[PDB]
Amino acid sequence: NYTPGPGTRF
Amino acid sequence: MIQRTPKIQVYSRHPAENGKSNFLNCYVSGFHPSDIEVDLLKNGERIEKVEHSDLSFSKDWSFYLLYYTEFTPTEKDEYACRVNHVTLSQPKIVKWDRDM
Amino acid sequence: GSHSMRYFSTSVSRPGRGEPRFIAVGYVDDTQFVRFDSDAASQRMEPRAPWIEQEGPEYWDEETGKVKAHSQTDRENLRIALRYYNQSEAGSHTLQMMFGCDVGSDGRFLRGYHQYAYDGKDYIALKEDLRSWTAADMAAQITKRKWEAAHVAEQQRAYLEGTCVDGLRRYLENGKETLQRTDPPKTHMTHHPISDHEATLRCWALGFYPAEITLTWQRDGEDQTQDTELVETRPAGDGTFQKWAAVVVPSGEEQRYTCHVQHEGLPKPLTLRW
């Protein structure tokens, strides 16, 4: 299973 | 930025038996950046139906790829892979040796 | 033994030729099982192992959703990095990410990962405690402060000890004939005369799984590294791996040498003698 969101930007 | 030269191996899936179906592999590993070109060669000419694995990388972030084709080795047919990458001054050719 | 699940992603910018290409792959131990390529027509996560094909449509939708969102994030991250470093828009850059988890031999969580590299060098990584970050430079320090404020560590930790582990356990069971097998190395030796004075002994390991292996030459019991050639472990294409190790031997001294093989599929290390 892939990591869920949300992604946080650099 | 950073650059790493590919390690190149060309080899068969199974020990070579003349006249018997096999797979010819070219494994390129430990390189960076990811753009790389590989041909498999039969008697100096490009083999057409070459496939490759999905781009992946190792613990040190360096990339690796397997290029492969079905082939039938014979006593006299000459096989090779040819590799180009930004780190190489010219395409590098490595002849297939059934014993490495 | 222990097992791991890993996702590896690569984003490469291509100035003047459109948006960056994003490729992600998923692995259980040394077995690939999914891929996504932003350049491909499907625009879906795709199966790359037989045992994953039994997952239903909701799996494929949700996994595609997550990896597409990643692709967009890393596209943004490539732009952010350029600005942080004040690098030219005319140059191509690479952003790589790795995440996943290890479990032990009875399926308990062992370790989790979440890290990035920019142009082949570590940028930022979740430390083993899953509570704090290591930043490689002043640019990653900015990212570190942001991720600290946003509580990214605890969000990823919940994933890594929860969903990551559950999925890995599920895959290990569904692909148990594939994934929970060990394939011991088939071993042999070949001889190659160099001159009247020298010959090469090559020690082979073939058809083994997983890829982790050790091959050592000894002379008279002494660990021999001087005059040994060792190739990188290479995939056979059929799910198994190959490796060899060679030594140049004074003609007639072949019997002094032993090849030593260690692998998880071997109950005891092997010693081979010509």
From TrEMBL, chain A:
Q: Which residue ranges run through the membrane?
A: none
Q: Which domain of life is it from?
A: Viruses
Name assigned to this protein: C-terminal core protein
Q: Which organism is it from?
A: Human immunodeficiency virus type 1 (HIV-1)
Taxonomic path: Viruses, Riboviria, Pararnavirae, Artverviricota, Revtraviricetes
| Name of the coding gene | nef
